């Protein structure tokens, strides 16, 4: 009983109203964009390597 | 996590910029190369 009551008192202190209008989705979208960029670059690079290999016969 | 993902983005952008740089130098060498008499 004592521990749970103390927890409830603390939770009142934090007071936890409406949800936190906090989101990390912006940085996530940006970082996914960067990963997609490096993916496109690596893809096209694999392609140009294939081409130069062919020519290099 | 915001700071972590920002650092990841910065690393990726740095790698990509250095890539576009090195490949640009190579492309200038080729600009010199693919322009020389193709008479044969």
């Amino acid at each position: 009983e004592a521990e749970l009551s103390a927890q409830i008192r603390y939770l009142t202190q934090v007071a936890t109203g409406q949800p936190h209008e906090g989101s990390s989705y912006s940085s996530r979208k940006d970082c996914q964009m960067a990963l997609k960029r490096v993916d496109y670059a690596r893809l096209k690079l694999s392609d140009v390597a294939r081409t130069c290999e062919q020519m290099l016969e | 996590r915001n700071q972590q993902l920002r650092t990841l983005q910065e690393e990726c952008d740095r790698k990509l910029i250095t890539l576009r740089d090195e490949i640009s130098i190579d492309l200038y060498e080729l600009e010199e190369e693919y322009y020389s008499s193709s008479s044969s």
Binding site: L45, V48, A49, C52 | K15, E22, I23, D26, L30
Partner: peptide, 30 residues
């Protein structure tokens, strides 16, 4: 002589492409 110079240039560029390929996909893996 130009043929030799040409395939030399393309081979150098191929080595460079291999290098940067590994680097980029590594940065992706990390």
């Amino acid at each position: 002589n130009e043929l030799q110079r040409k395939d030399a240039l393309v081979q150098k560029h191929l080595t460079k492409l291999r290098h940067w390929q590994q680097v980029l996909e590594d940065i992706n893996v990390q």
